[PDB]
Design a protein around this nucleic acid. Structure first.
Ligand SMILES: Nc1nc2c(ncn2[C@H]2C[C@H](O)[C@@H](COP(=O)(O)NP(=O)(O)OP(=O)(O)O)O2)c(=O)[nH]1
Ligand SMILES: [Mg+2]
Ligand SMILES: [Mg+2]
Length: 430
DNA sequence: ATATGACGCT
DNA sequence: AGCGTCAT
């Protein structure tokens, strides 16, 4: 009881842009705003692959990884914006720059960890302490939380969605202990006040809307964030966890969406995250290893200790392209030409990076995929990255993979290459 | 015929 | 180092 830690030590948020690439294209082109809209890359094969979908288009069943031609069957009036294409490949620069807009705003409030192109974790523990002293045990008004849901509420003894939201919020606020600066629920609440402010600033200054989760750790914040998308934020308290997890499929928790999660379900014969509480830590460790077992034992209780890393910038800078089916690269001159296209984009991005961020990459990782192999990568090799020069980088990349060629013929490259990937890594200050 | 980026294992 | 996992 009195010595059992409860993982209520931090206030952590996860901010995620709503249909991000779509919002970027909608800001630029007002004709797309408030429409069923999707963002696709390429266009020839079945109209392009969809990678972002507006909430209006989602209502018709349009999803990520759908071909545009297929999406149009679900949604005849679907509007499309295409990813820029440069040097014969998708060029994501517009979205990366839009991401930086958002991240720089977030960074004004607190330490952020860039988690993807459109989301960041925020460690609000300090900011919350500040704001709490700033306040004089002053009650928190529901007016400070106009887009916040409290997960699990309302409960106990309206038919509108906004109605429910306020009911739950009222119940939450009516029960808060505002004179105890160390109440975790109070700290979460103040955290949510700050995230309202953050989300307001992002929208005012960029035009982009986002959702957020506020809880005591990254996993719960990320889970919370998805509970009430779009344009809303969700507070998941420590106390909400038993009911929330009691029907929560294991695959919904970050890192359990793949094979480990499947084995948890398979080996233990369970479905829901809460069902994990019935196993001892040693049991879980026996099945899934020391780290995973410990992590699971704590997580199913709502406890997780992964820190918000102070890192706003990506650690690697890479470019890749798939060459599916018949388009697989079959000749030496083909492989070289595409390595060059990749290396030229990489040079551009690295030079920009060196100027903006005062660092230089020192290692170049070269990765390929051969026809027949259904892995992400067939093979990875590194070499020194000593100069930001596309021709040198592409020549080096070729050198470290040219032995993979099975062909005896000068011209030919067998087996044909279905993917090329160049990645700059191991940065140093500059 | 579905462009990236972080991290763990050995 | 090079491979595998998980993710957006
Ligand atoms: N090239 C490529 N881009 C992708 C992929 N997946 C996502 N992107 C891009 C496109 C996404 O816009 C962006 C953010 O990824 P999310 O946060 O998972 N989804 P979104 O923000 O669209 O909607 P919401 O969060 O409201 O559910 O990352 C992919 O598989 N490939
Ligand atoms: Mg998003
Ligand atoms: Mg995201």
């Amino acid at each position: 009881g009195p010595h059992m830690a409860t993982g209520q030590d931090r206030v952590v948020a996860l901010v995620d842009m709503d249909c991000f690439f779509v919002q970027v294209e909608q800001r630029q082109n007002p004709h797309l705003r408030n429409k069923p809209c999707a963002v696709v890359q390429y266009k020839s094969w079945k109209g392009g692959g969809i990678i972002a979908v507006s909430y209006e288009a989602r209502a018709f069943g349009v999803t990520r990884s759908m071909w545009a031609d297929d999406a149009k069957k679900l949604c005849p009036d679907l509007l499309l914006a295409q990813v820029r294409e440069s040097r014969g490949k998708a060029n994501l620069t517009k979205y990366r720059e839009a991401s930086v807009e958002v991240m720089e705003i977030m960074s004004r409030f607190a330490v952020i960890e860039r988690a993807s192109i459109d989301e960041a974790y925020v460690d609000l523990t300090s900011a919350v302490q500040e704001r709490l002293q700033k306040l004089q045990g002053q009650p928190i008004s529901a007016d400070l939380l106009p887009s916040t849901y409290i997960e699990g509420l309302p409960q106990g003894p309206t038919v509108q969605k906004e109605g429910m939201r306020k009911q739950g919020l009222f119940q939450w606020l009516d029960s808060l202990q505002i004179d105890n600066l160390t109440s975790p629920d109070l700290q979460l609440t103040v955290g949510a006040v700050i995230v309202e402010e953050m989300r307001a600033a992002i929208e005012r200054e960029t035009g982009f809307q986002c959702s957020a989760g506020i809880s005591h750790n990254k996993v719960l914040a990320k889970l919370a964030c998805g509970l009430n998308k779009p344009n809303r934020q969700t507070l998941v308290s420590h106390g909400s966890v038993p009911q929330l997890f009691s029907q929560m499929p294991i695959r919904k928790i970050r890192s359990l969406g793949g094979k480990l999660g499947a084995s948890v379900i398979e080996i233990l014969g369970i479905e829901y995250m809460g069902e994990l509480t019935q196993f001892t830590e040693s049991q879980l460790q026996s099945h899934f290893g020391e780290k995973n077992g410990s992590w699971l034992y704590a997580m199913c209780r709502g406890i997780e200790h992964d820190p918000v890393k102070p890192r706003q910038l990506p650690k690697t800078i890479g470019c890749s392209k798939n060459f599916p089916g018949k388009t697989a690269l079959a000749t030496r001159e083909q492989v070289q030409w595409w390595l060059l296209q990749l290396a030229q984009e990489l040079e551009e991005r690295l030079t920009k990076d060196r100027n903006d961020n005062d660092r230089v990459a020192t290692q170049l990782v070269v990765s390929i995929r051969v026809q027949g192999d259904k892995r992400l990568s067939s093979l990875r090799r590194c070499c020194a990255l000593t100069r930001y020069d596309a021709h040198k980088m592409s020549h080096d990349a070729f050198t470290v993979i040219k032995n993979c060629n099975t062909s005896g013929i000068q011209t030919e490259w067998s087996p044909p290459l279905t993917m090329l990937f160049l990645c700059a890594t191991k940065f140093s200050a500059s």
